C-alpha cells in the first residue's frame, strides 16, 4: 500500500514528462536528451526492489493507451539511425503483456523491416531484446515470426562477440519453444536453431549465458520426434555437467549482485516451466528445478515468499521428492524445500513382513488374483511366508499349474517387494544400501536380512551363497552385488 504509492508519485508525472518529450519533437538535438532522461531513471524503476516493479507493468497503459508507443513506432521510420538506435531501447523496456497484445495486433512489420539491418551492434542489441519480449505473446505471433524472417536475424547474430547481444539472443531463443506448441518446435530444428546454440552454451566467459542457452535447448528437446535430431546437434550433453558443477547459491549471488536481471522470470509465465519438472527428459527436469531453487533463494531473502502460496508451486515441489529416482533433481528439490522453510515428505510404504492372513487376502484381491485366495487361506500364508515364497511351493502346494500364471504372480510379487517397509526387521539399513546401486535391487533386502547378512558381514560372501541362501537368481544382479560389496572390503 504505502510503499506502492511512493513509486508512482515520482514515476507518474515523470512518465508524463516522458510522454510530453516523446510527442514534442525538436528532431535530433532534443529527442536525444529526452531519451537519456527517460533511460537513466525510468529503468531505475526496476532498481527499487521494494515496490516499483508492479507499478511499471500496470503504469504501461498510461503510455500505451495514449498512443506514445504507436506514435514513436510511426516516427521510427526516419531515415537517420542515430535518433532511432537510442529510441528503440525504451520499446523493450516498456514491453508488458498488455503492451504486447496491441503491437502483436497492429504495427507488426516495422520490426520485421528493421531486423534487416544487422551491422550496428547498438541497434541489433535493441532488436534482439524486442524479439525476446515479442516471442512470448501467443501462438499466432510465434508462427508469424517463424514464418517470416524473424528467426534468421537472431540466428545470424549468434556469430557475434557482444556480451549483452549474445545474452539477449540466448533469452530470445527460449521464448519460442514455450509459446510455439509442437509444430514450431519441429520447424526450429528444421531452421537449424539447436546447432547455433552450441556457441552460446559453450562459452567460458559468462555462466549466465551458458545457463540461458542450456535451458533454451532443454525446453525444446522434450518432443520425441525432434529429440533424435537435437542429440545429433552436439549440445544435449552439455547440460548435465553444467547443472552438476554450478551451485544454485553461486548463481543466485551472480544474480543478486548484478544491477539488472533481478526477479528474472516472475510469477506471470513461470508455470510453463512446471511441466518440464514432470516431463520424461531428465535434463529438462534438473534445469527447471535448478532455476526454481535459484529464484527461490533469491526471493527468500525478502518477504515475497507468499507468491509461492497462491500459485501452488511448493505443492509441485513437494510431490516430486518422494518416489523419484534422480539424485540431482531430488537433491535440488529438497534444497529448495528446506531453504524455503518447508519439510521434505517421506513415503508411506506398506509394512509387509508384519502382516497377517487377512492382509494377504486383501492384497490378493487387489492384484486381481482372487481365484487363489481360498488356497492361500487353507495353507495359512502370511507376510513372512509370502516374501520367502518359491516357485515349486507355488506350483505344488498352492496349485498354480501354468508357468505364465507364476510369472505374472512373481511380477506382482517383485513390484510389491521393492516398495515395502522393512524397518521392523532391518536394523543396519540394508534397503538404502541396495537401492543406492539400483532401485531394482531393493527387492532383495528381505532375503539378505533373513539370512543373517549385515553390511559389516557383506563383503565376505560367495556367489554360491547368494544363489542358494539369499535366493538371487539373475547372474547379472549377483555379479553387480558382488563387485559392489567386495570393493568395500575392510573399510571399517
Amino acid at each position, epitope marked *: 500500500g504505502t510503499e506502492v504509492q511512493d513509486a508512482l508519485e515520482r514515476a507518474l508525472p515523470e512518465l508524463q514528462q516522458a510522454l510530453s518529450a516523446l510527442k514534442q519533437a525538436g528532431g535530433a538535438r532534443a529527442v536525444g536528451a529526452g531519451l537519456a532522461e527517460v533511460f537513466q531513471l525510468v529503468e531505475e524503476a526496476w532498481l527499487l526492489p521494494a515496490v516499483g516493479r508492479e507499478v511499471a507493468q500496470g503504469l504501461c497503459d498510461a503510455i500505451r493507451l495514449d498512443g506514445g508507443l504507436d506514435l514513436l513506432l510511426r516516427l521510427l521510420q526516419a531515415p537517420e539511425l542515430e535518433t532511432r538506435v537510442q529510441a528503440a531501447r525504451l520499446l523493450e523496456q516498456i514491453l508488458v503483456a498488455e503492451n504486447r497484445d496491441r503491437v502483436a495486433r497492429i504495427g507488426l512489420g516495422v520490426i520485421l523491416n528493421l531486423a534487416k539491418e544487422r551491422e550496428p551492434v547498438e541497434l541489433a542489441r535493441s532488436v534482439a531484446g524486442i524479439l525476446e519480449h515479442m516471442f512470448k505473446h501467443s501462438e499466432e505471433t510465434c508462427q508469424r515470426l517463424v514464418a517470416a524472417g524473424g528467426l534468421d536475424a537472431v540466428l545470424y547474430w549468434c556469430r557475434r562477440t557482444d556480451p549483452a547481444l549474445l545474452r539477449h539472443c540466448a533469452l530470445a531463443l527460449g521464448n519460442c519453444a514455450l509459446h510455439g506448441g509442437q509444430a514450431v518446435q519441429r520447424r526450429m530444428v528444421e531452421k537449424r536453431a539447436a546447432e547455433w546454440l552450441f556457441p552460446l552454451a559453450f562459452s567460458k566467459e559468462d555462466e549466465l549465458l551458458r545457463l540461458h542457452a542450456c535451458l533454451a535447448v532443454a525446453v525444446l528437446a522434450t518432443n520425441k520426434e525432434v529429440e533424435r535430431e537435437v542429440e545429433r546437434s552436439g549440445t544435449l550433453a552439455l547440460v548435465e555437467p553444467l547443472v552438476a558443477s554450478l551451485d544454485p547459491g553461486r548463481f543466485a549471488r551472480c544474480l543478486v549482485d548484478a544491477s539488472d536481471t533481478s526477479q528474472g522470470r516472475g510469477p506471470d509465465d513461470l508455470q510453463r516451466l512446471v511441466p518440464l519438472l514432470d516431463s520424461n527428459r531428465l535434463e529438462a527436469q534438473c534445469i527447471g528445478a535448478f532455476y526454481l531453487c535459484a529464484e527461490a533463494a533469491i526471493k527468500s531473502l525478502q518477504g515475497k515468499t507468499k507468491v509461492f502460496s497462491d500459485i*501452488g508451486a511448493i*505443492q509441485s515441489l*513437494k*510431490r516430486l521428492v*518422494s*518416489y523419484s529416482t534422480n539424485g540431482t533433481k531430488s537433491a535440488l528439490a529438497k534444497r529448495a524445500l528446506r531453504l524455503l522453510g518447508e519439510e521434505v*515428505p*517421506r*513415503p*508411506i*510404504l*506398506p*509394512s509387509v513382513p508384519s*502382516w497377517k492372513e487377512a*492382509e494377504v487376502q*486383501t*492384497w490378493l*484381491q*487387489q492384484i*486381481g488374483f*482372487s481365484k487363489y485366495c481360498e488356497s492361500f487361506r487353507e495353507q495359512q500364508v502370511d507376510g513372512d511366508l509370502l516374501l520367502r515364497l518359491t516357485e515349486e511351493e507355488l506350483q505344488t502346494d498352492l496349485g498354480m499349474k501354468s508357468g505364465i500364471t507364476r510369472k505374472r504372480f512373481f511380477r506382482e510379487l517383485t513390484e510389491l517387494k521393492t*516398495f515395502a517397509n522393512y524397518s521392523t526387521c532391518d536394523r543396519s539399513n540394508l534397503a538404502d544400501w541396495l537401492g543406492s546401486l539400483d532401485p531394482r535391487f531393493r527387492q532383495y533386502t528381505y532375503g539378505l536380512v533373513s539370512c543373517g547378512l549385515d553390511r559389516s558381514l557383506l563383503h565376505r560372501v560367495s556367489e554360491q551363497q547368494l544363489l542358494e541362501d539369499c535366493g538371487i537368481h539373475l547372474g547379472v544382479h549377483r555379479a553387480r552385488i558382488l563387485t559392489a560389496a567386495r570393493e568395500m572390503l575392510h573399510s571399517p
Partner: nanobody
Amino acid sequence: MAVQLVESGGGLVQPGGSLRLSCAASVSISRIYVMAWYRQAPGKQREVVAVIRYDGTTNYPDSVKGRFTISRDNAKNTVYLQMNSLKPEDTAVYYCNANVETWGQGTQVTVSS
C-alpha cells in the same frame, strides 16, 4: 504412521444415474503408495472396485470397466470414485483402503426408487 480415513457420499440413487464417493486422509495423499476402493455385498466377501498408485496408474475389474472412475485430488487430499451408470446389483457397503492394511469406515449405497 497411523493414518485415519473417512468416507462420504452414498445413500439411495435411482437405477441409472450418477454418484460420487469421497475418501479423505489425515496426511498428504501423495505420500501414500497405493489407494483403493472396495465393495462388501450383504453376506458375502469383499471385492475390489478401483486401485490407484502414486503415479496415477489405475486398474479396474472387467465388470466396472467403463462405468466407474477413480482419481485423486491433492489440493484437498481426497480420492474420488465416480459412478456413472448404476445397476440394481451395485447395492453394498463401500470402503476405502490405504496401503493394504489401513481401512476406512464404509458407507451404504442402494439403488432403487
